[PDB]
């Protein structure tokens, strides 16, 4: 049921990340037909900083996943267009993350494009509205200035904090880049609730 969940929660993800859509939303059966034929579905969004974010949803059997050459071709032909790109989210099935090859093309395209964020994620990260899960505390991104004043009061360096991966599901839904700080409000059975600040490190892939 992964694709039906994706077709709703990818747009809930785009809305939660404060992005407007650059296309028209197609009926669900049209979505499935494009994924099955073209091999992927492309969603464009515009951030507040007028940057373009493109999301690629890949089928669990397409040519772009099993063969590195087609994925490389798609990445070169997507990163050569006339848009002000800010990030590429590539949504794949979970086993694709254990396949070394496609990960190597991802790392070369990161190296070949230093100002573009190339991220590859599994399906489960977008099959539910992650911020609304009960078990997940409330995450928020704080500015560099607020974090700097917090650390100056605390006599701390950013490396002294607890750290959170940039591929942590709530940090992905926030858009947390490495080097940012995420304030987390969590339930406590001793103080009834607590606040911590974590330092976003590099992603798993």
């Amino acid at each position: 049921m992964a694709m039906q969940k994706l077709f709703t929660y990818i747009y809930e993800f785009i809305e939660y990340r404060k992005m407007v859509l650059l296309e028209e939303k197609v009926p669900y059966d049209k979505f499935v037909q494009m994924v099955l034929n073209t091999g992927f579905f492309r969603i464009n969004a515009e951030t507040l900083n007028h940057g373009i974010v493109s999301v690629f949803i890949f089928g669990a059997n397409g040519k772009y996943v099993h063969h590195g050459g087609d994925m490389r071709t798609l990445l070169t032909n997507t990163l050569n267009e006339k848009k002000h790109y800010e990030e590429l989210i590539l949504i794949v099935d979970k086993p694709v993350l254990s396949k070394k090859n496609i990960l190597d093309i991802i790392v070369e395209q990161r190296a070949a494009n230093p100002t573009i964020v190339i991220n590859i994620y599994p399906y489960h990260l977008f099959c539910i509205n992650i911020p609304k899960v009960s078990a997940i505390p409330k995450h928020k991104l704080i500015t560099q200035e607020e974090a700097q004043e917090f650390l100056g009061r605390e006599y701390l360096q950013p490396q002294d904090l607890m750290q959170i991966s940039a591929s942590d599901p709530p940090v992905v839904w926030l858009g947390g880049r490495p080097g940012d700080f995420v304030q987390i409000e969590r339930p406590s059975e001793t103080a009834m609730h607590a606040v911590v600040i974590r330092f976003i490190t590099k992603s798993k892939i």
């Binding site: 489960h124 009960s134 607890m162 750290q163 991966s165 339930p187 001793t190 009834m192």
Partner: protein
């Protein structure tokens, strides 16, 4: 001239030739050990390498044996030798550089993107044999490690086999440039040439005294060194004589065995529990210590220990003679070693020597500055220790009472002090040492006094109280009626109860000799010193005993008002040990733990002095049933056996049908286990036989002094069914017999452990054996108590011990945050009180009636009530969510808080001179603002009063820490509750709230990671099975053994129908393709296939759409489907077929109309290009294996699924929080969180898994942190530790962003640079070897790093530095 220093860091490196030649103080030249009495000069025993003999000094430092640490020596090897520890390093250096030029063969700009301590190993991993150089064009040969030893390598140039002698290896490594080392992982200090040694280090004699067996290996090595030619030269491939080859391999083997033999080795001294680190560095043998058997003494206070006088004259206390104690110390000096108390030695500072007191001068005097070593006297403090030391109350400081009777050799202590040490008087031994230093003596009395351990750090509740005689004696004393009538005593006997308490005696002047005093009147005389308020029911009142026994109404409700015992008995509930909220816990909370210990002793003497006039005994007739009551028990037991026989007769006729899931065997045994349980009415004949007013066996049980109801039933009525592993006696005597006495497949209940006899009646041989089997199990599990938790304790401590409280109340590991605030509230576990929040459950109408103030019409009282609602709703929302992501953790209105504000208010309402105050709006308006401002400034408790005056901004995490206390203050100090309190009395209440809140904060520099490890490892004793070992090892999902899940239903309306829950619970379960198939065959065709060719006929005519397609080669995978299971779970044939050709489009099924025959295609075989043994047999089974695992219906990983009934809270339309009991959900067997979200019958926002790894993978590290707390909490049980000790495990294990373990792998990830901590844990030799090749810098912090370096941790009393106040001394003192 040498100033005071402290080691800040330790750097690890590899020692080369230059280091040995510069550190060494001499060179070993001869093999002569002793020329004469003195050691031979130039040998391995030379006096330049230190002195281990008491005749001669060290030549080097001119110190005696005690002050000389030894010095190293040099041995110039005639032949270079490989370093034994870094042999692997040598190997992995021979693989990545060219043997002819030294320039690297691999590409330097390929491995540079990885972290430095890895890229060298990665480069050595890739194959290099056959590769050719670029600057010298020399093909790099193979490097093959020999298997006849540990060090020799062979160069293999396409079959040319040569032996790489260490001279050749040094020549190869000498041409490696420094840039090659730097830019391919290693440091400038780890140049490979240092791996081959020509000058070895002979260790100092202080390391090898006993001029040992190491001295033989050093002596043998020096002798065979001399045989080797002085200038032997080795070139590549050169011929050498075999005698030299033997000598070269002999010195290398001797050196390798000198270091790493069987890891007489230098490195074999380190590893094990008896090794250097754990036995000599992490432990100690100490002087000035004693040990003896412990014994009881009811005349000792709880913080006193009785010390035998013979021990008091052995152990001493050092007293520096000054002008203020010269007169006090003179009697000790004059008594000497012949009269007690005396002394043993005097340290004269004008000669700097210690003189024994008996062989001492006649012209001797005590000068100011001498140190007198006097005896131990009454009032001295002493550390008291019982092993194993598992909690921090295992060492406590007691005031010494010297037992001057010479015939007593035991350590005597009060029975109520045994709760600290988990001790009893069956032969336990305890250690005792008396601090002799002034600094150690101060902190014994101020820090380590046993009053500090009165409240448990593990459980936050009291430890001490009455045990066994003051529990049953306090019951008898406060009992309303004696068998002699009213429970009273005359004035003389009331006075006699107090003549031992060692308090100030009360006044009995207003009592005639014939005036009678109640037992409660006498207790009230003692409790008036520390007036408390108490009201609970006693242990005496049990609803179990109520039907068969008459209770006196003024005994079953204990009440205390300002220290007056108004009614009720005192027993285990009030005065018992470990009783939370009892008399002594309340006394400690108002007057301090020392005042509570003084009252335990004082009420103990009233209890004991009462019984010495009332008597208490147990006899054989206390355990004997009346003949009428014996028949009543036999009737009850026959009913148990008759109901057990009814089940057997159903088994005879085959009338036992189990449910869906259980077999007939397990359903039969469940029926038997429950049919053979004693009814609650079994206590009618027991309670009919006994008189509760006189029976001593009943009164020990009923008051909670000792024993339990099953003990009374076993003794008096019957033992019943023996359950082992909640199961009956399983037949282990040859296939259906439990014992030789019972026939095979016996159906009687006696054959499986039902004991119809009580102990008082006497068991028979089969019943004795079954009871023996039951008893032996408990002994074995108690034997696993020590071993299982002991190993888990040491791994918990080494993972947690580096966590120490900062000056911000944060928890850090030297700089790195583990917790932003300790416990998220910043409080000590010994300073908490459980208090009820009384707005949580109220409705919007009840809350408005109770808490809305309508007396004055001002907007301030609308706002005051609105914050009450907001705190109410916020509390509801937070802990209603906590209920969602837990299995069975429900909302509570009772919290642990630093301060009990309700009791503080009422204790000031009673001691007031004013009654009901007149109405006064200004006073009410003034009081509201003072409470409002107090709550606003409350988080400044966490900073200081300087920042509160300046009103500097408060950090957000400190605002959140004061949220519970802000909520509580606004409840208990609401206007509707402080009407009678004056404004002057309000400022008194606020000051006392803020004082008690400051006193409850955790101390700077407290080792709270050790506290957590101690507190969580204690409840594992009553549990160390697989599940704890899965939480603490961070085991992945596939490694779990007890994975579960808790799926809620899609709708709060549909949760009520149990039938609807069963519909969904069957859908999600994994019904794969294997279990549907009863028979299957992998393959004019085979016989019995005429139906198949008939199936070929009728299937083709059904629909001509599809036929055996153009691709079908040679295989016939025919199966048949069990039809019972298809009906059982309502599977359909349409479902099965459509499932099979929607995941595997490599087949055509021919479903027929049950049989199924799967055929395949040739296209399925040729995309196996990654496989070059791909036959037809294996790949056909492989695709069957990939087809048989196809999910027919359900969620993968969900093996089972049951419907369970949940207890949950919810807010009504009236705002009331009700606990709904009629809620159904699914508890699967196996976790798949993502599978449950791809499903519309399950609510996706409340999926609860018991898997930490599955929660981390799906939800993140913050949800995995909460999961670790929940998963540890279940393992702890019902008496698990405080919640802040669980946050300590979870915050440490998740501090890096990933869930790390408490094993060596986790310590390596969290603290990689702390080499000394990691060596102390498991395996020093491998840890030290890695640290040397990495040039590891190890900053000194924590516990283990300073302990291994011989220093003390900067912790506790040493966390803050003391400096001398110059500006105060120059203006107040004179030279």
């Amino acid at each position: 001239e040498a100033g005071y220093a402290e080691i800040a860091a330790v750097q690890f490196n590899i020692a080369g030739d230059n280091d040995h030649k510069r550190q060494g103080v001499m060179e070993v030249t001869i093999s002569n050990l002793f020329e004469g009495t003195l050691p031979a000069e130039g040998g391995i025993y030379d006096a330049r390498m230190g002195t281990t003999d008491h005749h001669y000094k060290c030549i080097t430092c001119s110190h005696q044996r005690k002050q000389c640490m030894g010095h190293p020596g040099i041995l110039q090897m005639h032949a270079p030798v490989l370093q034994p520890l870094f042999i692997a390093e040598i190997r992995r250096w021979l693989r990545v550089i060219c043997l002819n030029c030294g320039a690297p063969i691999v590409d330097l700009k390929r491995y540079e993107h990885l972290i430095r301590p890895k890229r060298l190993i990665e480069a050595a991993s890739s194959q290099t044999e056959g590769k050719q150089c670029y600057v010298c064009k020399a093909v790099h040969p193979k490097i093959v490690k020999d298997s006849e030893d540990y060090f020799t390598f062979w160069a293999d140039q396409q079959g040319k086999i040569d032996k790489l002698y260490p001279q050749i290896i040094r020549e190869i490594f000498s041409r490696v440039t420094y840039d090659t080392v730097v830019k391919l992982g290693r440091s400038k200090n780890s140049h490979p040439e240092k791996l081959v040694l020509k000058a070895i280090q002979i260790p100092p004699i202080s390391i090898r005294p006993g001029i040992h067996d190491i001295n033989n290996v050093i002596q043998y090595l020096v002798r065979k060194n001399l045989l080797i030619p002085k200038d032997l030269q080795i070139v590549r491939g050169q011929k050498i004589p075999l005698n030299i080859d033997r000598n070269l391999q002999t010195i290398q083997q001797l050196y390798y065995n000198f270091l790493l033999d069987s890891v007489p080795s230098i490195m074999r001294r380190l590893p094990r529990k008896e090794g250097r680190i754990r036995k000599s560095l992490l432990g100690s043998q100490v002087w000035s210590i004693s040990r003896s058997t412990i014994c009881g003494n009811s005349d000792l206070h709880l913080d006193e220990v009785g010390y035998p006088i013979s021990f008091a004259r052995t152990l001493q206390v050092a007293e520096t003679v000054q002008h203020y104690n010269i007169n006090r110390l003179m009697p000790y000096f004059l008594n000497g070693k012949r009269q007690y108390p005396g002394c043993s030695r005097v340290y004269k500072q004008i000669t700097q020597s210690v003189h024994d007191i008996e062989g001492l001068k006649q012209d001797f005097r005590l000068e100011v500055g001498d140190i007198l070593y006097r005896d131990v006297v009454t009032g001295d403090v002493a550390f008291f220790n019982r092993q194993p030391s598992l909690e921090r109350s295992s060492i406590g400081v007691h005031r010494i009472v010297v037992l001057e009777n010479p015939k007593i050799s035991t350590f005597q202590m009060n029975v109520s002090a045994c709760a600290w040490y988990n001790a009893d008087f069956d032969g336990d031994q305890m250690n005792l040492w008396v601090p002799w230093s002034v600094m150690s003596r101060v902190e014994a009395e101020l820090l380590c006094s046993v009053r500090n351990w009165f409240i448990s750090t593990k459980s936050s509740g009291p430890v001490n109280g009455q045990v066994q005689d003051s529990t049953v004696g306090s019951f008898l004393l406060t009992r309303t009626n004696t068998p002699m009538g009213k429970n009273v005593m005359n004035k003389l006997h009331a006075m006699g109860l107090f003549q031992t308490t060692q308090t100030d005696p009360p006044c009995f002047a207003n009592y005639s000799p014939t005036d009678l005093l109640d037992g409660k009147s006498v207790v009230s005389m003692l409790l008036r010193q520390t007036p408390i308020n108490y009201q609970r029911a006693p242990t005496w009142y049990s609803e179990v005993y109520a039907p068969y026994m008459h209770y006196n109404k003024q005994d079953i409700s204990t009440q205390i008002r300002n220290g007056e015992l108004i009614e009720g008995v005192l027993d285990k509930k009030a005065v018992g040990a470990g009783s939370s909220g009892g008399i002594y816990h309340l006394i400690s909370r108002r007057y301090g733990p020392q005042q509570a210990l003084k009252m335990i002793f004082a009420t103990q003497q009233l209890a004991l002095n009462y019984v010495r006039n009332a008597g208490f005994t147990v006899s054989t007739a206390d355990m004997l049933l009346t003949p009428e009551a014996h028949q009543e028990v036999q009737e009850i037991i026959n009913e148990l056996l008759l109901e057990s026989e009814e089940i057997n007769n159903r088994l005879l006729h085959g009338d036992i049908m189990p449910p869906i899931g259980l077999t007939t065997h397990d359903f039969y045994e469940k029926l038997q286990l429950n049919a053979l349980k004693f009814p609650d009415r079994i206590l009618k004949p027991i309670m009919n036989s006994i008189n509760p007013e006189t029976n001593g066996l009943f009164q020990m049980v009923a008051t909670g002094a000792k024993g339990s109801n099953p003990n009374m039933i076993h003794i008096m009525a019957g033992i019943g069914q023996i359950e082992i592993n909640t199961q009956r006696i399983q037949p282990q005597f040859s296939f259906g017999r439990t014992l030789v006495y019972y026939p095979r497949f016996a159906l009687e209940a006696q054959a499986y452990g039902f004991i119809c006899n009580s102990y008082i009646a006497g068991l028979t041989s089969p019943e004795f054996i079954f009871g023996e089997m039951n008893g032996r199990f408990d002994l074995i599990n108690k034997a696993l108590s020590t071993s299982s938790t002991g190993y888990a304790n040491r791994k918990a401590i080494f993972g947690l011990q580096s966590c120490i409280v900062d000056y911000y109340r944060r928890v850090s590991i030297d700089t790195r945050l583990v917790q932003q605030l300790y416990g998220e509230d910043g409080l000590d576990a010994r300073q908490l009180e459980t208090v009820r929040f009384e707005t949580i459950m109220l409705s919007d109408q009840e809350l408005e009636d109770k808490f809305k103030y309508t007396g004055i019409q001002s907007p301030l009282f609308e706002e005051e009530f609105s914050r009450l609602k907001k705190d109410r709703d916020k509390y509801r929302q937070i802990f209603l969510n906590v209920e969602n992501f837990n299995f069975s953790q429900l909302l509570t209105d009772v919290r642990q808080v630093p301060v009990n504000v309700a009791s503080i208010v009422k204790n000031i309402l009673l001691s007031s001179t004013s009654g009901v105050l007149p109405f006064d709006e200004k006073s009410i308006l003034q009081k509201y603002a003072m409470v409002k401002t107090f709550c606003k400034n409350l988080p400044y408790v966490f900073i200081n009063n300087i920042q509160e005056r300046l009103q500097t901004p408060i950090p957000v995490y400190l605002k959140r820490a004061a949220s519970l206390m802000r909520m509580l203050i606004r409840i208990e100090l609401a206007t509707v509750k402080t009407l009678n309190i004056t404004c002057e009395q309000m400022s008194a209440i606020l000051d006392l709230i803020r004082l008690q809140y400051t006193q409850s904060l955790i101390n700077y520099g407290e080792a709270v990671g050790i506290l957590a490890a101690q507190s969580v490892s204690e409840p594992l004793t009553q549990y160390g099975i697989v599940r704890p070992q899965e939480i603490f090892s961070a085991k992945p999902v596939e490694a779990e053994q007890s994975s579960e899940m808790l799926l809620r239903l899609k709708n709060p309306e549909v949760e009520t129908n149990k039938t609807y829950a069963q519909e969904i619970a069957n859908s999600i379960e994994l019904i794969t393709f294997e279990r549907l198939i009863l028979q299957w065959h992998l393959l004019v065709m085979y016989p019995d296939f005429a139906s198949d060719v008939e199936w070929m006929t009728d299937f083709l005519e059904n629909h001509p759409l599809l036929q055996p397609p153009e691709d079908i080669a040679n295989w016939c995978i025919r199966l048949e489907l069990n039809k019972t299971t298809m009906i059982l779970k309502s599977i359909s044939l349409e479902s099965i077929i459509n499932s099979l050709r929607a995941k595997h489009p490599n087949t055509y099924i021919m479903h027929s109309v049950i049989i199924i025959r799967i055929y395949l295609r040739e296209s399925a075989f040729r995309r196996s290009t990654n496989t070059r043994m791909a036959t037809d047999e294996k790949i056909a089974v492989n695709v069957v294996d990939k087809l048989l695992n196809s999910t027919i219906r359900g969620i993968p990983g969900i093996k089972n699924a049951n419907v369970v009934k949940l207890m949950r809270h919810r807010v009504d339309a009236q705002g009331k929080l009700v606990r709904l009991d009629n809620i159904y959900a699914i508890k699967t067997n196996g976790t798949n969180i993502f599978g449950a979200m791809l499903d519309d019958n399950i609510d996706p926002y409340t999926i609860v898994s018991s898997s930490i790894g599955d929660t981390m993978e799906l939800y993140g590290i913050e949800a995995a942190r909460q999961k670790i707390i929940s998963e540890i909490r279940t393992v702890m049980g019902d008496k698990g530790p405080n919640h802040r000790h669980l946050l300590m495990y979870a915050d440490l294990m998740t501090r890096t962003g990933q869930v790390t373990s408490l094993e060596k792998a986790g310590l390596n990830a969290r603290e990689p640079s702390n080499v000394l901590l990691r060596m102390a844990l498991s395996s020093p030799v491998q840890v030290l070897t890695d640290a040397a090749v990495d040039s590891a810098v190890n900053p000194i912090y924590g516990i283990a790093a300073p302990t291994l370096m011989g220093s003390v941790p900067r912790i506790g009393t040493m966390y803050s530095d003391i400096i001398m106040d110059e500006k105060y001394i120059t203006e107040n003192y004179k030279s």
